[model samples]
Target: MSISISYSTTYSGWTVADYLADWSAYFGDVNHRPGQGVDGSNTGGFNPGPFDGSQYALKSTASDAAFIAGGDLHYTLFSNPSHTLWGKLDSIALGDTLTGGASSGGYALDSQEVSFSNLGLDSPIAQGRDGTVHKVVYGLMSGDSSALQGQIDALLKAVDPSLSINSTFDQLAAAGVAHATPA
Candidate 1:
């Protein structure tokens, strides 16, 4: 299963960071920026993800993670499930089904930080408003993400019975899920 969301290039009410993290937190099951906010102590509307003390795992290699997108948006993964979000952190991505689908992006969890002001290579698609609106989308799916969520749950349970599981289980799940998630 895959976790995906509905989003747009231009934000109406909030800023880019707010929009990005909020949706990721919702489907990915992690707090938006968790406890410590960098600027203004920022946090998402979905501040505390369903599983307390949980975070999305980021990656660099793109390795065995799930490929939830299409085109140049070639890769994305939950990467790993961590109590502490590891790797070069960025916004996360979502999916459609266990079988994958046609998406413009994968997750940014393993990639460079998505720019809020520019339509850089890492940003999703083309920016608009004559390059005024920083083009961005909230997730990877054109459909749904429950199947992917189920995959996330199974990965955690296998290591820790729950992310309600132990710190060790969390670690194990993170490591195990890093490789096992897409399967």
Candidate 2:
């Protein structure tokens, strides 16, 4: 399963700068764009991990090898898909790549943590970020066509509880569900 989160607000305080694995540990924070990560008192980057039960990281873009005396981080955290993020956000997909796909430059948070079962987890904790993000997905898979409708029905009945479920990701999405597809 993968975890994807996207925010559409001007970042300032408490933003996921770098995360290790599924809330195991994350650190740092941003200011305006995606850079300018600061540690304690805006001095450095992520060190031990999670602080104050909040997710965030600082930025410097100074070096990728390691955080110098003043900066957040880059490749020191991840080195794939360019990882050099510089923008607000169209989407963010994790559990699939490093740097949380931030380098994709506003990519539509692909399909990581968007499951109905996991919605309870992704949706609520993200509710704090609800004002920031528009979508949250958990896990991505392609099984038998049988499970397709099962997924849709699951969405309608358990997840959204509106007027959808057990169909294609596109179908659910057409109904206003924050979803994506492997296709």
Candidate 3:
């Protein structure tokens, strides 16, 4: 099943710079060092992973080959889509709401079932290079769709109240079939 949503809101008065700045601060807080992360001055917390409890690297361009120093990250973090959907969100007009689809799935560590999940309107944790699954916790396919949508709605609104929003998962489905052995 492919779970997707098109969460959009009126641009109102928010500019890409404004949204970028806000999200940058959020990322910085979430990605802070041990002395500054969520457990420290950050009120926001995240699921355990390179995003929260450890150091992660990021690059502006996918082929750059190295996560640049933080000062070099200006606008590049929002520019790529290889392993994340945020690449679809980099450009937007000041007079319109940004709309995009989101979906996530990967091998579950303890089971054969793949899992699908959601994320905040931000960049993905920088990992998965060199065949290593650089994450702290694994997965479960079960989740509450409405709750996720509501969270997105609230996030966009908080960024700019004049923003209007919509989130959907129209193509959600699973299929199975029976077969005879050695027919």
Candidate 4:
């Protein structure tokens, strides 16, 4: 099986610089931007404001390389959280025909620990004045067919058995596959 995984998460802190600095140590990047991410309001100067942005990263386990995509993250974790992640496949793997149509999919997460120093100045976490980081693991797949959906569902199930295809990732994967063809 030629397996590949990719994902991203948010770490919160009183200062974005702190959070990013802390997080980059492990994941190697604090700035990520994807077409899809989290949207929310952050408090600054004891008031509510908006922190709307996305962070991106292009990673290849096969190449053992990953880089920050030049943007902000999706979700938020006010105060570093501590968590670890891993997954296992049940009875699924894309066949050659399906592989040609199969899209790349994987999940990412914030390690359960949040550090204020890991984030950047403009980050929502800094505005929130909370030093924290959360671990998030997610998956991404590109497809637009029954075969694609089934493969993604199987992968999601492997990531978090307690969750179903109706969850955030489930919906995201579905949407991504809505018009996607194999590979």
Q: Which predicted model would earn the best TM-score?
A: 2
Q: Which 10-residue span in candidate 3 carries the lowest summed lDDT?
A: 135-144
Runs in model 2 lying further than 4 Å from the true structure: 1-48, 56-94, 100-166, 179-183
lDDT of 1 at 12: 29
Residue-level lDDT of model 3, residues 43-120, one tens digit each, is 122212223311122211112111111110111223342232111111111111111111112101121111122222
Q: What is the lDDT of candidate 3?
A: 0.22
Error of 4 at 40 (Å): 33
lDDT against the true structure, each candidate:
0.25, 0.26, 0.22, 0.24
> Residues 117-182, candidate 2, lDDT per residue (tens digit)?
222222122233231111121111111112223333443555456544323344444545434434
Candidates by lDDT, descending order:
2, 1, 4, 3
Candidate 2, after superposition: displacement of residue 138 in Å? 13
Better of 1 and 2 by TM-score: 2
- Superposition error at 14 for model 2 (Å): 34
Which ten contiguous residues of candidate 1 have the minimum total lDDT?
129-138
Single out the weakest 10-residue window by summed lDDT for candidate 2.
Answer: 134-143
TM-score of each: 0.22, 0.23, 0.18, 0.19
Write down the lDDT that model 2 would get.
0.26
